[PDB]
Paper text:
To elucidate the role of intersubunit interactions involving Leu46 on the structure and stability of MIF, we compared the structural stability, and biophysical properties of wt, L46A, L46F and L46G mutants at the secondary, tertiary and quaternary structure levels. To understand the role of Leu46 mutations on the three-dimensional structure of MIF, we also determined the crystal structures of L46F, L46A and L46G huMIF at 1.70 Å, 1.70 Å and 1.60 Å, respectively. Similar to the wild type species, Leu46 mutants crystallized as homotrimeric proteins with dimensions of approximately 35 Å×50 Å×50 Å. In agreement with our previous structural studies, X-ray crystal structures of MIF variants demonstrate that the Leu46 mutants conserve the same three-dimensional structure pattern as the wt protein. Static light scattering, in agreement with the analytical ultracentrifugation data, demonstrated that wt, L46F, L46A and L46G exist as stable trimers. Finally, crystallographic data and enzymatic assays do not show any drastic conformational change of the catalytic site or activity of MIF upon Leu46 mutations. Using hydroxyphenylpyruvate as a substrate, we showed that all Leu46 mutants are enzymatically active. In our case, chemical shift measurements demonstrate an extremely high similarity between L46A and L46G huMIF, whereas the L46F mutant exhibits a slightly different chemical shift pattern. Thus, decreasing the hydrophobicity of residue 46 (via mutations L46A and L46G) destabilizes the hydrophobic pocket and results in distant structural perturbation that is transmitted through the backbone, affecting the tertiary structure of the MIF. Taken together, our data suggest that the intersubunit interactions involving the residue Leu46 play a key role in the structural stability of MIF and provide new insights into the role of a novel intersubunit hydrophobic pocket in modulating MIF’s conformation, stability, and potentially its receptor binding and biological activity.
Numbering used by the authors:
A (entry chain B), B (entry chain C), C (entry chain A): 1 to 114
Write the structure that this text describes.
Amino acid sequence: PMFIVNTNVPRASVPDGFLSELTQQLAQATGKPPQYIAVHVVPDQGMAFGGSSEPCALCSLHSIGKIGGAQNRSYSKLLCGLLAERLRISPDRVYINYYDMNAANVGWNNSTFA
Amino acid sequence: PMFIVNTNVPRASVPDGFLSELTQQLAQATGKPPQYIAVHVVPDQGMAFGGSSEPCALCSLHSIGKIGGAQNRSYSKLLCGLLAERLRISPDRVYINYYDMNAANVGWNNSTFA
Amino acid sequence: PMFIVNTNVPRASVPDGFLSELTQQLAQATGKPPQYIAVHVVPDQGMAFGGSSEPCALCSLHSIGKIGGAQNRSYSKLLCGLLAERLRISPDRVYINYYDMNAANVGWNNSTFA
């Protein structure tokens, strides 16, 4: 699985530890070994939400399965919680797009997961 | 709706007010309320289009509904128009990927739009 | 087709010519003229793979068709090979998401490809 965060919060406000924290919390939440979890956080971005440049985040979670109605509500609670606590972003200024990827459509190690 | 623009145009050449103009014109085009529109502009990117480093852009528009054949033609004319006028990028060096997101696959405010 | 690479490899470790090499190699791989290929390389990223900040990449390939089981295995071998050779990233530290776009969902030059 892969989780990408894009945010207008400054780099200095992103805690050391945050990438590892997301890795651990996603590994637990998705049920997948942490070895497969990739995380990417992009601060200092030129973005607006609702026409305002108050702290916000645009995120994506891609997984091969483990994506669906209730699972996504649960990931949204977990991930908005982490963003509010660690980056001080209001949950109502966060979007997370969820992508259920086909195994044949994810490349890794010179091949795919199919 | 969420609209992201990645470009090799330098940050000094993105005018004041561009994020606000995009938010407004996206609200005019999709008819969704401005309060829910997110916009993100990433300049100074290492990009080529057709093997050339002349000004170009790669963009994405995600929306829950309001995506389709004639709608996306209308969005493309609006958005290439804004990129040409404001960032001086030729329309034929712009790609925009359109994504019709399932409400259940969009997280916000600790939950989803389901 | 559009190929995007995000990596923690530093800018100075990205060799001259890389965007043209990726344009040429993807044009031959997808059997399309290079005038259609857009490439985007983003170094210096705050990212981890499996909880480690060793060199890694998160990439996307979007195309109108030419996306499938065998085709995606072939693109992964080519692209992991280029990232290992040029950026010194281990193939088992690369994810590539593949997207078969419908023509109606790709904007270009004030309209779509539909």
